[PDB]
Design an enzyme around this catalytic site. Structure first.
Site, PDB file in Angstrom:
ATOM      1  CD  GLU B 171       0.928   0.684   3.077  1.00 44.84           C
ATOM      2  OE1 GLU B 171       0.591   1.400   3.047  1.00 44.84           O
ATOM      3  OE2 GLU B 171       2.011  -0.161   3.082  1.00 44.84           O
ATOM      4  CD  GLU B 314       7.855   2.348  -0.764  1.00 50.21           C
ATOM      5  OE1 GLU B 314       7.786   2.498  -2.229  1.00 50.21           O
ATOM      6  OE2 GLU B 314       7.310   3.867  -0.738  1.00 50.21           O
TER       7      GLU B 314
HETATM    8  C1  LIG Z   1       7.281  10.712   3.068  1.00 52.72           C
HETATM    9  C2  LIG Z   1       7.242   9.280   3.594  1.00 52.72           C
HETATM   10  C3  LIG Z   1       6.461   8.071   3.487  1.00 52.72           C
HETATM   11  C4  LIG Z   1       6.028   6.669   2.898  1.00 52.72           C
HETATM   12  N1  LIG Z   1       5.492   5.180   2.783  1.00 52.72           N
HETATM   13  C5  LIG Z   1       5.455   4.515   2.193  1.00 52.72           C
HETATM   14  N2  LIG Z   1       6.351   5.428   1.317  1.00 52.72           N
HETATM   15  C6  LIG Z   1       6.766   6.279   1.946  1.00 52.72           C
HETATM   16  C7  LIG Z   1       7.858   7.222   1.342  1.00 52.72           C
HETATM   17  C8  LIG Z   1       7.445   8.159   1.506  1.00 52.72           C
HETATM   18  C9  LIG Z   1       8.860   9.779   1.004  1.00 52.72           C
END
Ligand SMILES: Cc1cc2nc[nH]c2cc1C
Ligand SMILES: Cc1cc2nc[nH]c2cc1C
EC number: 2.4.2.21
Lengths: 346, 346
Positions: B171, B314
């Protein structure tokens, strides 16, 4: 050898500082990639790496040898398996061969004392046809140990010269969990019972005999815990010695070494005892299913990355972790930066 | 949807039996490769795999969306980051992009509810410009949730048709650890305090406010723990829903799905609640550094393979584990056999 030891380089604090800074500016919340970040900084500190987390060629060195202690009924695998499995290493059918191929690494089989005729295809550094039975005396002479350390150390650094930047260490030797446990007990000060494992499927009923054998080895040899070479030569084995020598060699060359499991932990204890300067070059792989694993890792102050309940040895664990190392590098080099995205965090 | 759920296949016990037998005859002491063996048997049971541990193409599906709860001061990352980071996914500079490339996997970015204009290059399945603020009402309507599940489910299985055999789920959504925690609390029955984490570096001082917000979400919505769709629609989010739908889709297609971290664990709880038949298709990756991780994994009865202290999300954790899956396959297929070496063990 004294030289060798004296010449192990300290980690580059300057490169590590630059590394950290670069990592912190990456497209992610600071410290969010955890141990992957730590690993990267760690690699950056290694002089043979040229100031940045890099991975060129990879090699897994497998140290093979037989042990006299086998005659004590401490291992259920037939003795011949060492020689057999060693030959198989040349054919790529072994677990380590399979995993290494998967990691794009090359396997170097080293005969340091197999009790059998020489195996064509295997690097010959045979000390003797198997080591002494630690149960009734020493595994070998101090001289023998130092010579092998030296010889393996050199072979190891020489590879660096051919483009190898990441090593993996492993072994092959029926009954080897016995000397491993005795070493662990000695360096760590744990009673044998607490460190003696099932090894290659030793029946629970035969356990007790394995513990007694370890206590005997120690009683008879009186190894000096404060002297790693002493411990290795007395209650160790040629394969244990070889593994320690790989560690020393990679350190001297300022390169990283991935550990494997229990047997490797024993070797690592010895190495650090012999040269504390070795510590920063060591990288754990997985958490071995051998009983004495937790004790040994605590003393090394290491926390492995993989929990796979593996207990095969051969360096299969070391190969499986190789991609993690490459991942840390990819992260460092290929992620974009916050600043370029105009992202500002508190 | 009822159909979909009804049609999830049971694992193939026959293929698993053949798998086990084959594994046992490999050039190693039985059970010595531990979790690697277990994983292989597990894959063999998956109908979309064709009766054997195989890995064709790999894909990581990243579900992006904004949450109204952000307005409660539960996240320090600017809201815009979702949209920004989503765009970056298209450029391959993100953590997941980097790790996936390393694993030879393809990243599918899916917009399920980002509060911003559409991002060219991103798959559009936008429900709304961000979900409702769970603090004062529901995240969305039941209808909305079911529709998205359905839609994502289908997209997921359709990929299978293109050669994908391994999925990874992830996500992207500022403030998403809030709804994740509320879900966990609900399904698991843990108090909010025990499951509320720091998320993307939330200052410790702001923690308390985060806990209160979770309790409020639950109090106000009264989600039914025995109804996964109810929980998701009330205290979940569009990204949580999408992840659950990926799980359902892979299960229906009889294919394996690698989880990521905390957010994914929440989704997995929902999925299993909705369809227990989903369970056997799930594969953990790493052990998230989020506070509520242990509780969530216990309820899923899962033990991850990697301990990396990661908390990026992610789907970066899911990508990092991909090689382990391929390793299990390589082991199965390429190792030689004891019998061929004439090796006999008790
Ligand atoms: C701040 C930030 C939060 C995230 N959460 C997942 N990918 C990310 C990338 C960044 C830069
Ligand atoms: C077959 C076999 C392979 C091994 N590799 C390491 N220890 C081993 C023991 C056995 C028995």
């Amino acid at each position: 050898l004294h030289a060798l030891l004296r010449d192990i380089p300290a980690p580059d604090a300057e490169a590590m500082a630059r590394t950290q800074q670069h990592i912190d500016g990456l497209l992610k919340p600071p410290g969010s990639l955890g141990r992957l970040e730590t690993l990267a900084v760690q690699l950056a500190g290694m002089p043979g790496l040229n100031g940045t987390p890099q991975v060129g060629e990879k090699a897994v060195l497998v140290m093979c040898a037989d042990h006299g202690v086998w005659d004590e009924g401490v291992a259920v695998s037939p003795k011949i398996v060492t020689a057999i499995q060693a030959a198989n290493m040349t054919r790529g059918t072994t677990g380590v061969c399979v995993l290494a191929a998967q990691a794009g690494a090359k396997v170097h089989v080293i005969d340091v004392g197999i009790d059998a005729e020489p195996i064509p295809g295997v690097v010959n550094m045979r000390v003797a046809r198997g080591c002494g039975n630690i149960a009734v005396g020493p595994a070998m002479s101090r001289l023998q140990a130092e010579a092998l350390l030296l010889e393996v150390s050199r072979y190891a650094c020489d590879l660096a010269q051919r483009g190898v930047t990441l090593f993996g260490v492993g072994e092959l030797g029926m009954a080897n969990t016995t000397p491993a446990a005795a070493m662990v007990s000695v360096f760590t000060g744990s009673d044998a019972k607490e460190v003696v494992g099932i090894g290659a499927n030793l029946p629970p009923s035969r356990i007790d005999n394995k513990v007694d054998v370890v206590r005997r080895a120690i009683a008879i040899n009186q190894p000096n815990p404060r002297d790693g070479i002493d411990v290795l030569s007395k209650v160790g084995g040629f394969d244990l010695v070889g593994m320690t020598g790989v560690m020393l060699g990679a350190a001297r060359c300022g390169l990283p070494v991935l550990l494997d499991g229990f047997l490797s932990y024993s070797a690592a204890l010895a190495a650090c005892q012999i040269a504390p300067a070795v510590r920063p070059y060591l990288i754990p792989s997985h958490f071995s299913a051998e009983k004495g694993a937790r004790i040994a890792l605590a003393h090394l102050s290491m926390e492995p990355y993989l929990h796979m309940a593996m207990r095969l040895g051969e360096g299969s664990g070391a190969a499986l972790a190789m991609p993690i190392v490459e991942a840390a590098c990819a992260m460092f080099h290929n992620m974009g930066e916050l600043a370029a995205s105009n992202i500002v965090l508190p």
